């Protein structure tokens, strides 16, 4: 049986399974405790029990193994990993480990692992002889990540406007500069849906920082790819280590020539958490934010690259502006030139209830020649030069009106060039 199989079950199953196995009062305690008790009960019987999850390396090799569906929460069900097999298998943070697990002995309250049978969805010997992520030489974006679903959905206009506005490809470094109440959440939702539909091969990851629980639940129940979120209730160190786990897992996955995509909401909140967790270095900029505090997020946002050998790590992270707190924009101008893809959203368009509220004139993508063919690039250039004089609200209303009466992007282009 699988520990992951237990964790994917709902909460009520504790009555069906826990009580049937002889447990007395699993009704009233935290879910990880129910999982721990049931799996201890099953282990006492003696049958083989499986396990899997993402590896974490502590400061002294006191390794742990967390679960993705639990948002990497430190719980009793975490799998202990001694330094001996860490040295033997040359493991590190972010490694996906699957195999046998051992019932705890006296003096231990964590389930250690007997022997691993899969590392990063591959044999341990094949995973051992893999070069590090940072040794890989980056490149520019080559493969285009088209967001046009093509299913004729009623919400597909957002994806179409995204395709016309800013091209997204493998290995880009993207920013979504938007005010509050502008449509960031469901824009990222549409991006995730389009990625899951058009590109099932690439691994899709969504990361949510200090977000309300209802949005977390909706995101979990909507996107097909795995999503990890930490709420605002949880402390700053929780946010930091969740982000570290996500980035290490992405690096390990892309080390195997796999395309990884990370949607981040939001880089501003992650930067705030890093600022409030990093010890003061004596140099504080305007807004009560340390200098080296932004150093850690940039690395997280700097891992987006197109690996020459194989694979690509794409990061689309949204940023917050004009929230009333000056720290937000103070972070903002430290992130302007660091991204190669940028998308502006404006409050004024959202006020007119016109969605998606995209500032087409100001948003754009650099080095787009390497990502698209010349003919549709020329069509986009013609659209840009005929849309530049118009105001952003006028531009969006005209664009949605024109796109409503078409079917696909090519149909829109041919209709536009006919006129």
Ligand X SMILES: Nc1ncnc2c1ncn2[C@@H]1O[C@H](COP(=O)(O)OP(=O)(O)OP(O)(O)=S)[C@@H](O)[C@H]1O
* Sequence ranges of the binding site for ATP: 169-174, 181-186, 212
Q: Which residue has the tokens 């209303």?
A: 397
Query: Element (H or E) spanning 238, and its range?
Result: helix 236-254
* One of 22, 107, 152, 324 touching its own copies (CB under 8 A): 324
CB 182 within 8 A of CB 347: yes
Query: Element (H or E) spanning 314, and its range?
Result: strand 312-320
Told to check if 209 binds ligand X by CB under 6 A, we report: no
Least separation, in Å, of the C-beta of 108 and its own copies?
A: 25
Angle at 160 between CA 172 and CA 396, to 5 degrees: 105
CB closer to Mg ion out of 70 and 185? 185
Check residue 17 and report its DSSP letter.
Answer: I
Q: Which residues are annotated as a binding site?
A: 169-174, 181-186, 212
182 binds, among its own copies, ligand X, Mg ion, none (CB under 5 to 8 A by kind): ligand X
CB closer to Mg ion out of 100 and 298? 298
- The interface with ligand X within residues 158-187 (CB under 6 A) comprises 158, 180-186
361 binds, among ligand X, its own copies, Mg ion, none (CB under 5 to 8 A by kind): none
**Is the four-CA dihedral 405, 411, 413, 417 of positive or negative sign?**
negative
Locate 411 and state its tokens.
């149909």
Told to check if 304 binds ligand X by CB under 6 A, we report: no
CB 176 within 8 A of CB 349: no
- DSSP of 34-72, one letter per residue? HHHHHHHHHHHHT---EEEEEEE--TTS-EEEE-TTTTT
Q: Of 93, 111, 106, which Cα lies nearest the Cα of 3?
A: 111
CB closer to Mg ion out of 266 and 312? 266
CB 313 within 8 A of CB 138: no
- How far are the Cα atoms of 344, 375, 398 from residue 392, in angstroms, in the given order? 11, 25, 10
* One of 41, 90, 117, 406 touching its own copies (CB under 8 A): 90
Told to check if 325 binds its own copies by CB under 8 A, we report: yes
- The interface with its own copies within residues 129-158 (CB under 8 A) comprises 129-132, 134-140
Could you give the residue ranges of the DSSP H alpha helices within 258-362? 267-277, 295-302, 326-332, 347-351
Least separation, in Å, of the C-beta of 337 and ligand X?
A: 5
- The interface with its own copies within residues 192-211 (CB under 8 A) comprises 210
* One of 123, 128, 367, 407 touching ligand X (CB under 6 A): 367
Least separation, in Å, of the C-beta of 318 and Mg ion?
A: 9
**Binding stretches for its own copies (CB under 8 A):** 11-12, 15, 25, 27-31, 90, 92, 128-132, 134-140, 173, 180-181, 210, 212-214, 216-218, 231-233, 235-236, 276-277, 279-280, 282-283, 285-286, 288, 291-292, 295, 298-299, 302, 305-306, 323-325, 327, 333, 336-338, 340, 353, 366, 381
**Binding stretches for ligand X (CB under 6 A):** 155, 158, 180-186, 337, 355-356, 366-367
**Binding stretches for Mg ion (CB under 5 A):** 185
């Amino acid at each position: 049986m699988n520990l992951t199989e237990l964790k994917n079950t709902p909460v009520s199953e504790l009555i069906t399974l826990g009580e049937n196995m002889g447990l007395e009062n699993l009704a009233r305690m935290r879910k990880q405790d129910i999982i721990f008790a049931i799996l201890k009960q099953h282990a006492k019987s003696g049958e083989d029990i499986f396990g899997d999850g993402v590896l974490e390396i502590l400061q002294d090799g006191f390794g742990f193994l967390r679960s993705a569906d639990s948002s990497y929460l430190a719980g009793p069900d975490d799998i202990y990993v001694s330094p001996s097999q860490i040295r033997r298998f040359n493991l590190r943070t972010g490694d996906t480990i699957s195999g046998k697990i051992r019932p705890p002995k006296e003096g231990e309250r964590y389930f250690a692992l007997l022997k691993v049978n899969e590392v990063n969805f591959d044999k341990p010997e094949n995973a051992r002889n893999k070069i590090l992520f940072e040794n890989l030489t980056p490149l520019h974006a080559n493969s285009r990540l088209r967001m046009e679903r093509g299913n004729g959905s009623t919400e597909d206009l957002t994806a179409r406007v995204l395709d016309l506005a800013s091209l997204i490809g493998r290995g880009q470094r993207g920013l979504i500069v938007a005010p509050p109440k502008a449509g960031k959440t469901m824009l990222l939702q549409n991006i995730a849906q389009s990625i899951a539909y058009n590109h099932p091969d690439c691994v899709l990851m969504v990361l949510l920082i200090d977000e309300r629980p209802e949005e977390v639940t909706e995101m979990q129940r909507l996107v097909k790819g795995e999503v990890v979120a930490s709420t605002f209730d949880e402390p700053a160190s929780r946010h930091v280590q969740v982000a570290e786990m996500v980035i290490e897992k992405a690096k390990r996955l892309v080390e195997h020539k796999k395309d990884v995509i990370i949607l981040l909401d939001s880089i501003t909140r992650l930067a705030r958490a890093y600022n409030t967790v990093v010890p003061a270095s004596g140099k504080v900029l305007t807004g009560g934010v340390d200098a080296n505090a932004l150093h850690r997020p940039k690395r997280f946002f700097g891992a987006a690259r197109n690996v020459e050998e194989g694979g690509s790590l794409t990061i689309i992270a949204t940023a917050l502006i004009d929230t009333g707190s000056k720290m937000d924009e103070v972070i903002y101008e430290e992130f302007k030139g660091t991204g190669n893809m940028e998308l502006h959203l404006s409050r004024k368009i959202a006020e007119k209830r016109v969605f998606p509220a995209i500032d087409y004139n100001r948003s754009g993508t650099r080095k787009e020649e390497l990502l698209t063919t010349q003919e549709e690039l020329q069509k986009m250039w013609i659209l840009r030069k005929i849309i530049h004089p118009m105001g952003e609200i006028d531009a969006m209303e005209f664009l949605i009106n024109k796109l409503a009466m078409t079917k696909t992007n090519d149909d829109f282009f041919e209709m536009m060039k006919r006129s």
